[PDB]
Design a protein around this nucleic acid. Structure first.
Ligand code: NA
Ligand code: NA
Ligand SMILES: [Zn+2]
Ligand SMILES: [Zn+2]
Ligand SMILES: [Zn+2]
Ligand SMILES: [Zn+2]
Lengths: 162, 162
DNA sequence: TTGACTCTCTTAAGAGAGTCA
DNA sequence: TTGACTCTCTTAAGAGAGTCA
């Protein structure tokens, strides 16, 4: 098994490589009508992506390192969390984009949480709009708002009460 | 079926049948430390379910009627909305449980909206906790709260900024 | 050891359609 | 005509693993 020092070396090489990705400044809603700025380190749209990186899906990548003749591979956003527990409350931990920008690999824009917690950030009002996430959101979720509901609750007869 | 009259007849028959499902009272969080009461009309756990109804999955059902010698079939929660547009902004409209109770078929607990709007209600603070849904939530979403994040954003080196 | 592709799978909110009696 | 089963698919947040040079 890879030692702690070996895993730290993997994290360090990943950080070195991602830190050289193009850094894109994005202005974002924070909630409460306030605007903020995030700096995303974006993996390229097409090969080459960076040392150790390869695309396994339209917006999925993996990081690969060969250590003592054995190939090891991880989801590209999971690397910052290799020294953390990988489940909680019986749920698998997932890399969760606080910046909501899939190509971004900035570890300051990632957290490690259940898929439900991850998804729920899409609708959060944001750090200046009432976010209650213990690990606070960096921005208002892209899907926060009144929604676009086509039809509400309704009945034709009188068979139902709310 | 094609005609408006035929569609209204399908809606009326569905309402009459669902109107005879057992009515189960559920006390629910509203947000803001308040609680409310919902009356769900719950499809049975096992066959028979009711005239026109059959189970296609663990928590999936369909409603079917024979019109002009042809069988017409719909997802069991879609029937109230047969006269509504079936898409919005190029996204499929879905039946969305305001009561977060799959077996419930009370149309006063359903709306018709994109899958993203639908999902997002799981994390809404609720009608007394800040819900901004234009078609208002009936309860706080079951997944609202601080979450259980295992690890937050972090870096080992000095290559990244927020 | 490395790059650039290939494939299928998970989850939990939702769907459509066929086989028998 | 109606009932009771069977199967796979959609979405958008996420995954593991194979092949070739
Ligand atoms: Na996310
Ligand atoms: Na829902
Ligand atoms: Zn980012
Ligand atoms: Zn938040
Ligand atoms: Zn209900
Ligand atoms: Zn709401």
């Amino acid at each position: 098994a890879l030692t702690n020092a070996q895993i730290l070396a993997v994290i360090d090489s990943w950080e070195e490589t991602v830190g050289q990705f193009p850094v894109i400044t994005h202005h974002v809603p924070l909630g409460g009508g306030l605007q903020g700025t995030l700096h995303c380190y974006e993996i390229p749209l097409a090969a080459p992506y960076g040392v150790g990186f390869a695309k396994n899906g339209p917006t999925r990548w993996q990081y690969k390192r060969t250590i003592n003749q054995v190939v090891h591979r991880w989801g590209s956003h999971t690397v910052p969390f290799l020294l953390e527990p990988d489940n909680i409350n019986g749920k698998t931990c997932t890399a969760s984009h606080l910046c909501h920008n899939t190509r971004c690999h900035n570890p300051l824009h990632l957290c490690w949480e259940s898929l439900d917690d991850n998804k729920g950030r899409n609708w959060c009002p944001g750090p200046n709009g009432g976010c209650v996430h213990a690990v606070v959101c960096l921005r208002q979720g892209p899907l926060y708002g009144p929604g676009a509901t086509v039809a509400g609750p309704q009945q034709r007869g009188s068979h139902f009460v709310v």
